[PDB]
Design a protein around this ligand. Sequence first.
Ligand SMILES: Nc1ncnc2c1ncn2[C@@H]1O[C@H](COP(=O)(O)OP(=O)(O)O)[C@@H](O)[C@H]1O
Ligand SMILES: Nc1ncnc2c1ncn2[C@@H]1O[C@H](COP(=O)(O)OP(=O)(O)O)[C@@H](O)[C@H]1O
Lengths: 516, 516
Amino acid sequence: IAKVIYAMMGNKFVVDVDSNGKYVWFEFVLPGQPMNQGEIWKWRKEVNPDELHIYISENFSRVMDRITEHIKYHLSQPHESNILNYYKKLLKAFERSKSKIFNDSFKKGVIRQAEFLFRQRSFIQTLDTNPHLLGVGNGVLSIETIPAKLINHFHEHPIHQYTHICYVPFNPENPWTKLLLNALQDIIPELDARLWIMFYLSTAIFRGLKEALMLLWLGGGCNGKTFLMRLVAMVLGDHYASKLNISLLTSCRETAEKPNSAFMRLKGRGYGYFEETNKSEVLNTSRLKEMVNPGDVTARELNQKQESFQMTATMVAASNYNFIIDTTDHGTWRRLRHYRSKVKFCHNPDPSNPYEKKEDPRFIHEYIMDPDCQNAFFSILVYFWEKLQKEYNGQIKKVFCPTIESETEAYRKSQDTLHRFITERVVESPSAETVYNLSEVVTAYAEWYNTNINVKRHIALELSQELENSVLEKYLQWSPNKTRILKGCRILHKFETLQPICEPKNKWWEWSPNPS
Amino acid sequence: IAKVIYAMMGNKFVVDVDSNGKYVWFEFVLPGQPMNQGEIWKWRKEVNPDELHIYISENFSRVMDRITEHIKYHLSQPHESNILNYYKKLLKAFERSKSKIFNDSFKKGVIRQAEFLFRQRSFIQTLDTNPHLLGVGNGVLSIETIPAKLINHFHEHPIHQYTHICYVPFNPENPWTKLLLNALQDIIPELDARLWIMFYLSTAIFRGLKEALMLLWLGGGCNGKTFLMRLVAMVLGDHYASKLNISLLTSCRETAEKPNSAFMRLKGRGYGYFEETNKSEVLNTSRLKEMVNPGDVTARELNQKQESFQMTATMVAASNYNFIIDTTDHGTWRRLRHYRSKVKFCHNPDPSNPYEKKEDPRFIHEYIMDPDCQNAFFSILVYFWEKLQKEYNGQIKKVFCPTIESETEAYRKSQDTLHRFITERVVESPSAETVYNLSEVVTAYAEWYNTNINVKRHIALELSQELENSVLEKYLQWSPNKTRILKGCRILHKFETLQPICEPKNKWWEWSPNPS
DNA sequence: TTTTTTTTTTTTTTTTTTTTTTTTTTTTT
DNA sequence: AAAA
Ligand SMILES: Nc1ncnc2c1ncn2[C@@H]1O[C@H](COP(=O)(O)OP(=O)(O)O)[C@@H](O)[C@H]1O
Ligand SMILES: Nc1ncnc2c1ncn2[C@@H]1O[C@H](COP(=O)(O)OP(=O)(O)O)[C@@H](O)[C@H]1O
C-alpha cells in the first residue's frame, strides 16, 4: 500500500530526519480543514500522522471496492473452467486480505514502511533559509520584488514559522493608520530623525545579513520609549523577535565552565531589544563587537556543545539612565548610534511648552492587543521598508540625517574620563616645577576616576599609551634612563585653579527627494 | 536473503560499531542519486538503512521472477509423474513465501541478520587518519604528491569529513584571484613577511604532526586583521577549522570537577585563531607549552571520559592591545613568533602616506559568502603550500625572513620587567651604600611593578634567582652568615635624577629567486 | 565583597515491548 | 466435514 499511498498524497506529507534521529512528519495545510488560527498555506510539524491513518482506512477502501467490482465483472462474463477456478481462488484470497487495512498493527507497519518513500533529503536545513519570505496569518508575504507580493494559494516554498498578524496593503485612510501616524509624529518632532528611526526599524523584517549598526536612545522618563519598541516585538511575534537581558552586556567575561544560555538567542530572530534597566551600568567592551558584527557567533547554552551560527537581528537599547563607554578605538564608536528624546509626557500639560504633552496611558495598557492596530502597524512598516529599498537600495548608512551623527559625536565627546581629567587637573606650568615621572599621572587619574565616576580596577601599563595619545603628547619628554616623563604641568587636588529644520505640509511619510 | 543482498552491493554499504556499541551504517555516495550539496564521491554516515530497504523490494524482486519462470519451464518439459509432483510442491511452497519480502518485520529481521555480514572490522577508528586527503565539494583532493590530484571518480580511501568548497586549478587570470592578490599585497607591503605569512597559513590544510609554532601579530586597529583570519576559517569550514576563546588563554587553571569542553577541541581541526577580544589581557605562561607542542593532550568533557588525542593545528593570534608574557627560559620564547602591522585603514585617506589606505568595508560585510572568491582563495592556498613543499621540504623553520625573528627578538627585549626596573631605579653605588640585606630590591620592585604595570602576587624564591641571572650578578656579594648580600648598589627611590628589502616587478607570488 | 557556583551536572530515563505466540482455511483426513 |  505504501506505493499507492505515495500516489495518494505525494504533495501533502514530507518525512525528514531530525538531529536526534527520530523521523518527523510535516504536512501542508489547506483551507477548509481542522486547523489552528492563521497557519493557512504553511507547513506544520507533526509526530504521528492522523490524516494519513484516516485516509488509509476511509478513502483507500474505495479502490479495494473498485478492484472487487472489477473481479465481479470479469467473473460474470463467460469463460473456461480453469480461468473461473483461478478467479475464484484470487477472489477468496483478496477477500481474506481485504479486512487487514483496518487493523492497528498493520496500519502502523504500513506507516513505518511508507516513511521511507516520503523522505526528502535536505528539508530541515533548508527551512526558512530564504530571508525574503514571511509567514503571516493569511498566507505568505514575499519581499523579493517591489511591491511585496502576498501568496495565498499552492506553492513550493518551505516555510514553517510564522506570525499571526494578517497583512493588508498600506491604506493611509484607515483610522488606525492615521492615529498611529499622528502619535508617531508627536513622539519625535524632528522629521529627519523620524524618517531615520522608521527606516532603521523597517530592516527588522529582513533576516539575512545586515550592516553592523547599534541603536541606543536615552530619555529622562515617561517618554515614547517602551511603547513602539514593545509594539514592534508584539507585531513580529515571538518567532521573529525576542527580548534580551541587559546582563548580556554588563556581565564580565565568564569562564568556559559557565554555560551562557542567552547567547543562543537571536537564532533566526531578526529583532532583539533590551528593556529599560533600573540603574546606570558599565559596559565591559566585550559582547559589543561580536553582537554588532555580522560574522559568525558561537556559544554553548546548557548541557550542549559549542555551536556556530549567523546572527542577523536589529538591536535597540533604551534606558532612563545613562550608559558607560570607555574606549576610543575606531573599530567601535563607529558602528554605534545614540539618540536623546526631547519630549516629555505628564498628566497636566504645561502651556506654551511644545516639548511636553499629556500622556495617554491607554496607549500602553491597551492598543497592543487590538489586532487592527497591529495590522496597520505592519502595513506601515512594510511600506517604509519598500521605501528604503526603492530609494537607498537597502543601504541604511546612505540615508542622511543631520541631527544624527551630530548628537552621536557629541555623546562621543562625553564618556571620555581621561580628557576630562586632563582638563580638570593639569595646567600649563611655565616654570618652577618638576617632571613628575609617569606613575603620578596614572595614579591621579585612577583616584579621580574612583572619586568622580565610579570605583573600578585599572592597569597602570595600559593607561600610558593613551597618555601619549592624549593632548599631553607635546609635553611628553624622554629621559636619560629611557623613560617617559611629563613637563609643563601642575598636578592639582582641589579647585585652586588660580595660579598665574523643516516640517511637512500634511504628510511626512510621503517624504521629499532630498532628505526632509 | 542476507547473503544474496551482501552479494548485491558489497561495495556500497559498510557496518561498524561505535563506542556506545550501537551499529552504524556508512554509504558511498555516487553521482545521480539524492544527496545534499557537495558530498559526492565521499562516504556518509547513516543510522537506519533506507536505500537498502528500497533495494530489498525493488531490484531484488526481479531475481525471484527469474526463479519463478524457470520452474514453469521445468514444469513445461514433459517428465515422470513424481518429478512433476515434486516441482508442483516446490512452486506452491515458493509462491506463498514470495510475498514475504514485503513484510516490514521480515525486512527488519533480514537487515538485522545482514548487519553481521556487512561488518568491516577496524573502519571507524581508521577514518581520516591519512592527513593527505581532503573532502571537497567536487570530490576529494590528495596532496600526497606534486601536483595535487583531484579525484572525482571511484576510489577506496575511507574519508567522511569534508568541506563544501569546489576546487579549481590555480589560475592568476581569474578576476577574484587578481583582486585577492592585490588586496593581500596591500595588507602587508613587506615581500618577505608576506611570503612568510602565506607559507605559515598554507600549513593549515595539513592535519598531521606540525612544527611547534605560535604566531601572534598586533596592530593599532582597523587593519588587515580579522579579515583573512576569518576568511581562512570560513574557507576551511567548521569540519577542519574552529574558533576558540581567549578565556582559554587567560584562565589561570580550572580545578577538578571541570566540565572542560573548549580544552578538548581541535579533533583533526588544523587551524585555530583568536579574534581581537578583551583589552590588553595577560598570559600566565600556562596553556602554551601543551598548546604549542606536537604532543598528545588528554581531557574529559561533559558526561565523558578523559581521552587523549594528538593536537595538530596551526595557531594564530591577533589583538589591538598588548600582551603580557613573563618568562625567560629558552624552551619558551623559541616556539613563538611576533609581528606588528604597519598600515592603517580609514574613510579619509592621507595623501603621500604609503602606510594609510582607504578601507573597503565590502571586504568584510560581503566577499565571504560569495563562493567565487572562496574557490580562488583555496586555489591560492594550495598553490602556496605546494610551493613551500617544493622549496623548503615542508619545514617552516628553514624559510628565510629577515624582518621576522628580528622584530620578534625586539619584542622579547620588551616584556622583561626586571631589566627595565634595574635600569630605572637601581644604579651603581657611589658611596655610603650598605649590603641592603637580601631581596629588598625585589621587595621594592614588587610595588614598582604594581604601580607601573599591574597588580599581582610574587614569590621571593624564584625572583631571587633571576637577580643572579640579571646583570646585577657582578654586584652581588656573599656574607659571613652565608647569605647573598647585594653590594655596589645605590638602590635609588626617586625620579629626579641619579645620585652620583625589495619587491619584484608585478608578481610577488612568483616568489622571486631563492633569496627572494 | 568578591568569591566557586552550587547546582548543574547528573540522573533519569528510555522503553519495553511487542515481538510474537496462537491461528490458519484449506488441506487432510 | 472434522482434524492437522
Ligand atoms: N504620542 C503619544 N501621545 C500621548 N501619550 C503618549 C504618546 N506616546 C506615549 N504616551 C503615553 O506616555 C506614557 C510614557 O511612559 P513610558 O512609555 O513608560 O515612558 P518611558 O518608556 O520613557 O519610561 C505611556 O504610558 C503612554 O501611554
Ligand atoms: N587591503 C585592503 N584594502 C582596502 N580595504 C581593506 C583592506 N583590508 C581591510 N580593509 C577594510 O578595512 C576594514 C578593517 O577593519 P578590521 O578588519 O576589523 O580591522 P581590525 O581587525 O584591525 O579591527 C575592514 O572592514 C575592511 O573592509
